[PDB]
Each structure stands twice: as C-alpha cells, then as structure tokens.
Amino acid sequence: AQESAEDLPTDLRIGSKMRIVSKVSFPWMNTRKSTGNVIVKFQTNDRFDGMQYFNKTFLNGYEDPTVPLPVSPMSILEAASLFYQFPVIPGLKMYPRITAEQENVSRVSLAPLVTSTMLEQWQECYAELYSSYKKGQRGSFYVATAVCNVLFTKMPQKLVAVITHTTSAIREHLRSQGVDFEAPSPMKLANQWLNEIGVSPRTDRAGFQCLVVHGSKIHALFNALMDSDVVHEKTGPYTKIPPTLIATSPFLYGQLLSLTKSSNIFAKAGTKCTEYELKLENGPVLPHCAKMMTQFIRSTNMCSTEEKPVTMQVMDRHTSQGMSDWTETATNWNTVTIAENCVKWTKN
Amino acid sequence: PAQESAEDLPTDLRIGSKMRIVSKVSFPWMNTRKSTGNVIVKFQTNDRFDGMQYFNKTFLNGYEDPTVPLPVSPMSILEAASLFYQFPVIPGLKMYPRITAEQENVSRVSLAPLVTSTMLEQWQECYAELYSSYKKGQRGSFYVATAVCNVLFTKMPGQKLVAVITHTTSAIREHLRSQGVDFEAPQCLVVHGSKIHALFNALMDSDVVHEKTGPYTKIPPTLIATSPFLYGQLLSLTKSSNIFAKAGTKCTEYELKLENGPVLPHCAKMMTQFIRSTNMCSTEEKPVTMQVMDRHTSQGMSDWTETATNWNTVTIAENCVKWTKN
C-alpha cells in the first residue's frame, strides 16, 4: 500500500548511495536528447554560496530551519552534498566499515610514526566531540566501527545512544565491559539424581540485533569505545586505523568533504520517455541530504507536470537497521516519489 | 630609541613560527601552584567549544566581522585565537615552515605512490577552488608556503587585488620571468591586477615548487586560510605555560608559549583582547610583554600599504600599546 505526507518523512539510517530518476531534464543538460554521459558542470559563485548556506544552516550545532535560501538552485544541490569526517588518508575509502560490506579495497602500507600519531590525535578528537555532545550543546553524531554503527542523539532534554548490527558475542563483550541496555531447571535435578544414585556426573543467537542506551548509562559505552581491541582492528586492510567519525558541524581535526556527482541521459524505443539520471556516491548519505535535495527539485519546477513524477532511491540502509525505531518522529523508507503537493512512499 | 605608540594593536601581516608571552602577574589557571617549572593549561567545560563558536562567527562571511559579542568565559579567547585551516595534512609530519634553509631535522616519512598521486589530484582541485573564490568572490585573503618561496594573496580596500612574494633569489626571479610572470621589483616582489592570473598558472604548473628529492619528495605546497574550504582541516597550536622566580628576588616570571604552526594577525589581536579582559595589565612597573619569532622570511608582506607595520615585540597598557620601532 501507499503512504503519503506533505513533506519528506525523516529516516535516520545512513546509506551508501543515492540515485534520482526523472522524465524532465536537469538545467545543465538542456542541449541534448541523445543517449550519453553528462558532466555536472557548476557555474560562477554557486559552490561557494552553497557552502555559505550549509554552514549558516548548522552554525548553532543543530539545524536552523529558518535560514533564507540561496539564489542559484545549483547552490542548494551543492549544500546538500557536504559533511565533516575524521580520520584522513588520501586514497583509502573510509565508509562502509563493517567487514562484510567492503569490496576488496587495495592495501596501503604506512609507517609506525604515521599510525601512532593518528591514534594519538584520534583520542583527543573523540573526547572533544563526546564532551560537546553530553555537557555542551551539539545535536548528534555517528561512529562507524568495524563491527557496528553507533549513533548519539537527543530526544525532543534526555540523551539516547543506539547501536546496530550486533552479534551475541558483541552483546556479551559489552556486558563484560559493564554496559546496560534495554534489549528488544531439570538438568540440575538430573545431575542431583545421578549423584544421589552414585552415577558419575561426567556421564542465545537471535541473529543480528540492535541496542538502545538511556541516560547516565551512556558514559560506560563511551569508555568501552575508547578502550577495546574489538573495535581497533589489529589485522587486515584497516590495521591500526581507528574508527571513522562523521558530523554536520565542525570539530577539531575534522576535514570538510563532498560526495561525487554524475549524470546520464537515456533514450529508448522512439517513445516520449527519455530518462535523466543523477547520482551521488562515495560517502555517507546523511539524513539532511534528502531533505535539501527535495528543495532542489521543487525549486527547479520539475514537478510542473505532476502526471510525470520524479523518484528518489537511497541504498544499503539495512546495515544500520534500528536507528529509526526509538521514536514516532522517524520512519523507515527506501524509495520515494516527489510531487509539489505531496511526498509518497510504500508501506514497507 | 624610537619608542612608538598607539591606542590599539598595529597590524603585521608577516607570519610567525612561534609566540611567547611574559608577565609578572599569574595566569588564572596557575593560581593554586606556587613553585617553579611546568604547569598544565586546563579548561572548564564549555571553553573550547564556545571559542570555536566565536571564531567561526567572526569569520563567517570570509572576512573579519569586528562586531561579534564576546564569550562569557575569558578562557574561550585563548582557544579561539589559535585556530586555522590547512591543507595537506599527513599525521606526524611538519607542514610549516617549508623553506629549506629554515628546517630542523624534520622526521623521516615514506609513502606509497598511490597516496601521493591521489593527494596531488586533490591539491589541484583545492587550489583552484581557493583562487576562484578569492578572485571572483568575497574571500579576503589566503597564504601559500612552498620549498623555495612564500606567497600572500590579498585585496586593498570594488577593490584592487594584490599578490606578494618573499625570499626570492636571482634564479627564482629569472625563472618567474621565463614562466612569463612579469612583475614589479622593489628580496620580495609585488604583482597587481590581471597579471596575478599568470602567477596563479605558474604556481599551478611550475616544476620548481615540486621537488623530487629529500623529505618533501612529491608533496605539494601548503595552503592556509581562516575561513573554511574544501579538504581543509581545522587545527590548533600547541600551548604550554611556565613559572620562575627572578633570581631569588621578589620579582617572578609567568610564561605562556604557542608553537607548531603558522602565527597569523588575528591571533595577536585576540591575544590582546584576552589580556585586556583578564585585568592582568593592572600593575604599573609590570605591563605585559609579547614576542613573535621568525617574521624575517616573510619580510616585505607589510610594506605594500601604510596600514600594515613591522614589529617583533609589543608591551601592553590598558589604554595604549607601545613598541620599539623597527
């Protein structure tokens, strides 16, 4: 069945890729109607203006929904595609980090000085982010370890932490570390009976799961993520490389980065249906990205024949399953239809 | 000597490598400890976050806004006065200063071809973005450091664009003219207007700034600014503090040092506000002294206008600023 609203519902699961398909051409494409590949070409101050709009949206440490828009809609497209990340290595992919989801990225040999100084910086960077989250005023942030994804956030205060894609072994290791969570005999009589006669006594899985932590108990999880060799890989392509941290507001050692963009034109069978494709790749697709991309489409009036809709798709969200279950303000969705009058999705 | 004075801090655009501040009155965190040697700087809860907030609110539009209200904590300004953006960064390697005459034994590093090649492609994009925003947008200024040179890009107060190069040689000046950069030559160099584009192309293309030997093999030049840019990393300077007695007399030393990176004009300006807000100035024989090192390699950067100035040492009074004229 179909579900619908005036505006895009929020989903908090981070994905790996976004694809958007339309029957109406994008502004840089308008010369062409033959099948082929097209560069997303930017013009004059559009990138810089989009960067301004992004930082102005997130300056307080949480989103301001009342900032005025830029003038070029290309700046809205640019502002949707930005984030802050640590650690930094050129030429190594830093997301996704769960070992099952890596394609075989190439080896990179590094010096012990490089790896040691990186770890020394990582501890300070992580402690700064966690301090500003708990006792300061920062909104939220993500961590992607080799075995799980973690989200720290606030309830609309009360603090909440969510862990996803755990095994029973990881659950028991966290129990040994002392974390608590709001998770989702006749054999003794037999041994006693054997001993009473004088016969010799020598004669949980539950798949993948998520976890939720409330309140003061979050600090134990913070110390656990600081300490364990379980999350610090000692063998493999990510040997001695610490976990990835991601945010939408600046932090010390954070590097500003952008997703890769490209686009294509397809034509078929002599029909009216030429199809125009946009892609955003090679990083996390954070929840604000879809919200801003909706505004890019509606500002550029591609909905004007609402009888020809535009569709959007976000991929690999199942690796972070559970991050939208803890509240009524969020939703799980995978494919979305945009019109000017509404936004629609399946019952899922 | 020529003791010179004003009400406020005069501007020096030469970039320092090291800063030292000396007082006969204790800094606020030190007040428990009453002996010589090291003491570790410590912050209360929101100091390092409110400082970052104030810093980005100052430089939000790509130039300084002087009208921002100040933080509550005095301690925020020390953190906020020591933040800057830099590309490229490798962990555990010195990125500034680059000019090969001024180097320590900088640490041995080796890297695979993949990392250096990908880093070069990223640098080629990033440099174009900074130059484009500067030439045809509101971005005020930025710095470039490189193995045999030092470059500043700025604008003079709808404005006239100026580029300055320092610490040249005969081979470097001849090589720039062979590259087609033709310039005024008052050793430093000055370029204006449309002729800046040829220097941008020469910096992008030229073999000279891309040495294939030594520790800085195949590393591109360093790019530095105060407001964010693509691939830029937010960083901070090292801080440390120290105490002495003045040779057994009742006078005493309190010392604060900032190290490991460039030192920029806004740093000294906000340091002045830190001293003038802590009420540390209020003793008559004992005003506070400030010193900056190694500005001579950047000499010439303060000459192109009357509003800039060269100085190496400043003494602070609550209503005035006094220094020896250089």
Q: Are A76 and A82 in contact (CB under 8 A)?
A: no
Preceding omega of A87 cis (within 30 degrees of 0): yes
Asked if B109 and A113 come within 8 Å (Cβ–Cβ), the reply is yes
Asked if A88 and B137 come within 8 Å (Cβ–Cβ), the reply is no
Asked if A113 and B119 come within 8 Å (Cβ–Cβ), the reply is no
- Rounded distance, CA A50 to CA A74, Å? 8
- Rounded distance, CA A288 to CA A285, Å? 8
- Rounded distance, CA B300 to CA B186, Å? 9
Both structure tokens of B312: 């190496």
Asked if A48 and B139 come within 8 Å (Cβ–Cβ), the reply is yes
Chain B residues close to A91, C-beta within 8 Å: 114-115, 117-119
Under DSSP, the state recorded for A52 is H
Asked if B112 and A116 come within 8 Å (Cβ–Cβ), the reply is no
Chain A residues close to B82, C-beta within 8 Å: none
Asked if B233 and A255 come within 8 Å (Cβ–Cβ), the reply is yes
Asked if A256 and B91 come within 8 Å (Cβ–Cβ), the reply is no
Alpha helices in chain A (DSSP H): 46-57, 73-79, 112-134, 168-177, 186-197, 218-227, 287-299
Q: Any idea which residue has 């390697």 for tokens?
A: B93
Asked if B234 and A257 come within 8 Å (Cβ–Cβ), the reply is no
CA distance B233 to chain A (A): 4
Bridge-based pairing of strands B252-259 and B19-23 is antiparallel
Residue in chain A nearest B236 by alpha carbon = A252
- Rounded distance, CA B55 to CA B84, Å? 10
Chain B residues close to A255, C-beta within 8 Å: 89, 231-233
Both structure tokens of A292: 């801003």
CB neighbourhood size of A47 (10 A)? 22
Asked if B115 and A89 come within 8 Å (Cβ–Cβ), the reply is yes
Asked if A136 and B232 come within 8 Å (Cβ–Cβ), the reply is no
Resolution, given in Å to one decimal, reads 3.8
- Rounded distance, CA A251 to CA A255, Å? 9
Testing the interface with B: which of A132, A245, A282 to mutate, by most B Cβ within 10 A? A132
Three-state SS for A77? helix
Q: For chain B, list residues whose CB is within 8 angstroms of any CB belonging to chain A.
A: 45-46, 48-49, 52-53, 56-57, 60-61, 88-92, 107-112, 114-115, 117-119, 122, 129, 132-133, 136-137, 139, 228-236
User: Could you tell me the sign of the dihedral formed by the alpha carbons of B274, B278, B281, B287, in that order?
Assistant: negative
- Rounded distance, CA B206 to CA B178, Å? 11
Three-state SS for B77? helix
Interface size between A and B, measured as CB pairs under 8 A: 95
- Rounded distance, CA B39 to CA B30, Å? 7
Cross-strand pairs, B324? B3
CA B221 to mean position of chain CA atoms: 16
User: Which of B117, B118, B232 has its CB closest to that of A256?
Assistant: B232
Chain B residues close to A257, C-beta within 8 Å: 230-231
Closest CA to B251 of B260, B243, B241, B263: B243
Q: Are A12 and A331 in contact (CB under 8 A)?
A: no
Q: Are B85 and B233 in contact (CB under 8 A)?
A: yes
Asked if B110 and A108 come within 8 Å (Cβ–Cβ), the reply is no
Degrees, nearest 5: CA angle B169-B173-B174: 115
- Rounded distance, CA A86 to CA A152, Å? 16
Asked if A253 and B234 come within 8 Å (Cβ–Cβ), the reply is yes
CA distance B71 to chain A (A): 14
Residue in chain B nearest A119 by alpha carbon = B91
CB neighbourhood size of A335 (10 A)? 14
Residue in chain B nearest A108 by alpha carbon = B112
Could you tell me if residue B87 is left (phi over 0), alpha (psi between -120 and 50 degrees) or otherwise beta?
beta
- Burial class of residue B280, CB neighbours in 10 A (0-12, 13-18, 19+): buried
Question: How many residues belong to chain A?
Answer: 348
Chain A residues close to B231, C-beta within 8 Å: 255-257
- Rounded distance, CA B245 to CA A139, Å? 47
Task: Report which secondary-structure segment, H or E, holds A170.
Answer: helix A168-177
Asked if A106 and B114 come within 8 Å (Cβ–Cβ), the reply is yes
Q: Are A79 and A92 in contact (CB under 8 A)?
A: no
Cα torsion through A205, A207, A208, A212, rounded to 10: -60
Cα torsion through A137, A65, A73, A294, rounded to 10: 100
Residues B59-89 as b or e (16 or more Cβ within 10 Å = b):
bbebebeeeeeebebbbbbbbbbbbbbbbbb
Q: Are A102 and A178 in contact (CB under 8 A)?
A: no
Three-state SS for B21? strand
Under DSSP, the state recorded for A84 is E
Both structure tokens of A132: 């500003």
Residues 6+ apart with CB under 8 A from B79: B43, B47, B48, B51, B52, B236
Three-state SS for A38? strand
Q: Are B316 and B275 in contact (CB under 8 A)?
A: yes
Residue in chain B nearest A55 by alpha carbon = B60
- Rounded distance, CA A184 to CA B281, Å? 61
User: Which of A88, A113, A128 has its CB closest to that of B233?
Assistant: A88
Q: Are B295 and B310 in contact (CB under 8 A)?
A: yes
Strand blocks (E) in B123-266: 142-146, 149-156, 160-165, 189-192, 222-225, 233-236, 238-245, 252-259
φ and ψ at residue A126, rounded to 5 degrees: -65, -40
- Rounded distance, CA A58 to CA A37, Å? 34
Both structure tokens of A188: 């003794």
CB neighbourhood size of B289 (10 A)? 14
Both structure tokens of B271: 């340091």
Q: Are A289 and A17 in contact (CB under 8 A)?
A: no
Chain B residues close to A90, C-beta within 8 Å: 88, 115, 118-119, 122
